[PDB]
UniProtKB/Swiss-Prot annotation, chain B:
Compartments, as annotated in UniProt: Nucleus; Cytoplasm
Lineage summary: Eukaryota, Metazoa, Chordata, Craniata, Vertebrata
Family per record: Belongs to the UBR5 family.
Protein's organism: Homo sapiens (Human)
Residues spanning the membrane: none
Protein name: E3 ubiquitin-protein ligase UBR5
Tissue and organ distribution: Widely expressed. Most abundant in testis and expressed at high levels in brain, pituitary and kidney.
Domain notes: The UBR-type zinc finger forms a pocket that mediates recognition of type 1 N-degrons. The UBA domain recognizes and binds ubiquitin. It acts as an ubiquitin acceptor required to place 'Lys-48' of ubiquitin into the HECT domain activie site, thereby potentiating the E3 ubiquitin-protein ligase activity.
Function: E3 ubiquitin-protein ligase involved in different protein quality control pathways in the cytoplasm and nucleus. Mainly acts as a ubiquitin chain elongator that extends pre-ubiquitinated substrates. Component of the N-end rule pathway: ubiquitinates proteins bearing specific N-terminal residues that are destabilizing according to the N-end rule, leading to their degradation. Recognizes type-1 N-degrons, containing positively charged amino acids (Arg, Lys and His).
Subunit structure: Homotetramer; composed of a dimer of dimers. Associates with CDK9 and TFIIS/TCEA1 and forms a transcription regulatory complex made of CDK9, RNAP II, UBR5 and TFIIS/TCEA1 that can stimulate target gene transcription (e.g. gamma fibrinogen/FGG) by recruiting their promoters. Associates with the E3 ligase complex containing DYRK2, EDD/UBR5, DDB1 and DCAF1 proteins (EDVP complex). Binds TOPBP1. Interacts with PIH1D1. Interacts with CIB1. (Microbial infection) Interacts with human T-cell leukemia virus 1/HTLV-1 protein HBZ; this interaction modulates HBZ stability.
């Protein structure tokens, strides 16, 4: 880094974070997210430089809200989706909710988005005027024209979609909104989509006429894929726009209430809340994975390995080691560590002696009795997601792998 | 009715009185305003109009005696 213009300031996103005159002590960095805790017990959370345009909801300056207790944050972790922080006796997480959580929230929206549908009883006649705020009855919930980031294939990407995914388990084809275009169709999966377009923005289909028992509506940019140029100037072809209009029946529309958003909920958690942990359970180490948040809980001479679920706030999967807890605690209390990538990688557990604790699961579901490794004690372990490249015709070799 | 658009099972056909609140004269030729043709359409479907074969005179005799 050589900032010729201003050598006193580095990391050109730093002035966005407001950390030009602050002392920082804690760092948490991964593929796309970033968080730094400063001497002012203030945590700044932000994204990569590439996703700067979406940082409005994805970047936070260093500030401790009244929701936070204001105490000394013990440590931090952050995945590609959300940030978790560790106090002495508190674990607080916030950020974009997991894909399953977003889907189940959409269920609370998609069902309620079916509000205009009448019941079995004699419903009252709706007040209808030509040009009133209504949209399409069907619930794609996401049409072409929304840009979001998917971090699959070992390389993060941000792009727009092309068709609405009717089946929430089927693949789809998108188009990247690469910055160089302003200065490729890909068959993807919906697990990695964030949908940063947020509230509304789905209905822009201005209702333009009502005739017979039908409505005439044209969405912007509904021209066909023919080689004819989409003339947006004053000399636009009337016949092309004639062939590109939409004619629907009034039964195929749902009412857009005055001031009522078509979807409503937020695909982002801006507020902290408690990751439920029992009393006196000292947290040996923390890490953020796809299933939730990893932890090692202690009470007396009792050591447990747990993964905490987002929705309930408690440890979804708790297990007691088959070996004695005194060995795992070891001589050095702090030398324990938990390692995970955040979305897709095996976990690593590090105990006091300096070496590693093997992991395997029995058919019951608990931790297998470990098979010892003859490894010497380890000091640092770097874990990362690396995508193998130049795959011949998308062979059976997997796209991504873990580097340890 | 001159069906100017056919899209799937739906058709856009023009009829007199299809104009919007605009009172401008119906200039549907080369100088047709896009808003004019956009708000001066009539909505029908395929199952609402029967096809008339081109070049075939419909059987419409006059019911008025002349001789």
């Amino acid at each position: 880094y050589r900032n010729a213009q201003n050598p006193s300031l580095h990391h050109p996103r730093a002035t966005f974070l407001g950390l030009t005159n602050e002392k920082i002590v804690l760092l948490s960095a991964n593929s796309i997210r970033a968080t730094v805790a400063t001497e002012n017990n203030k945590v700044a959370t932000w994204v990569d430089e590439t996703l700067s345009s979406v940082a409005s909801k994805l970047e936070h300056t260093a500030q401790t809200y009244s929701e936070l207790q204001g105490e000394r944050i013990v440590s931090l972790h952050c995945c590609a989706l959300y940030t978790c922080a560790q106090l002495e006796n508190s674990l607080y997480w916030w950020g974009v909710v997991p894909f399953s959580q977003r889907k189940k929230m959409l269920e609370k929206a998609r069902a309620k988005n079916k509000k205009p549908k009448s019941s079995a009883g004699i419903s009252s006649m709706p007040n209808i005027t030509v040009g009133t705020q209504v949209c399409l009855r069907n619930n794609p919930l996401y049409h072409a024209g929304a840009v979001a980031f998917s971090i699959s294939a070992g390389i993060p990407k941000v792009g727009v979609l092309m068709e609405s995914v009717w089946n929430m388990n089927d693949s789809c084809r998108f188009q990247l909104r690469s910055p160089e275009s302003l200065k490729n169709e890909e068959q993807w999966s919906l697990r990695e989509v964030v949908f940063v377009e947020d509230v509304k923005n789905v209905p822009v289909g201005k209702v333009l006429k009502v005739d017979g028992a039908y409505v005439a509506v044209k969405f912007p940019g509904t021209s066909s894929n023919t080689n004819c140029q989409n003339s947006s100037g004053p000399d636009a072809d009337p016949s092309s726009l004639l062939q590109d209009c939409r004619l629907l029946r009034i039964d195929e529309l749902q009412v857009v209430k005055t001031g009522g958003t078509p979807k409503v909920p937020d695909c982002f958690q801006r507020t902290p809340k408690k990751l439920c942990i029992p009393e006196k359970t000292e947290i040996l180490a923390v890490n953020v994975d796809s299933k939730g948040v990893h932890a090692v809980l202690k009470t007396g001479n009792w050591v447990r390995y747990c993964i905490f679920d987002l929705a309930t706030g408690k440890a979804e999967q708790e297990n007691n080691f088959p070996t004695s807890s005194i060995a795992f605690l070891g001589q050095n209390e702090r030398n324990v560590a938990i390692f995970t990538a955040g979305q897709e990688s095996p976990i690593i557990l590090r105990d006091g002696n300096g070496t590693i604790y093997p992991m395997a699961k029995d058919c019951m579901g608990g931790i297998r009795d470990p098979d010892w490794l003859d490894l010497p004690p380890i000091s640092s372990l770097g874990m990362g997601v690396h995508s193998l490249i130049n795959l011949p015709a998308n062979s059976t070799i997997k796209k991504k792998a873990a580097v340890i």
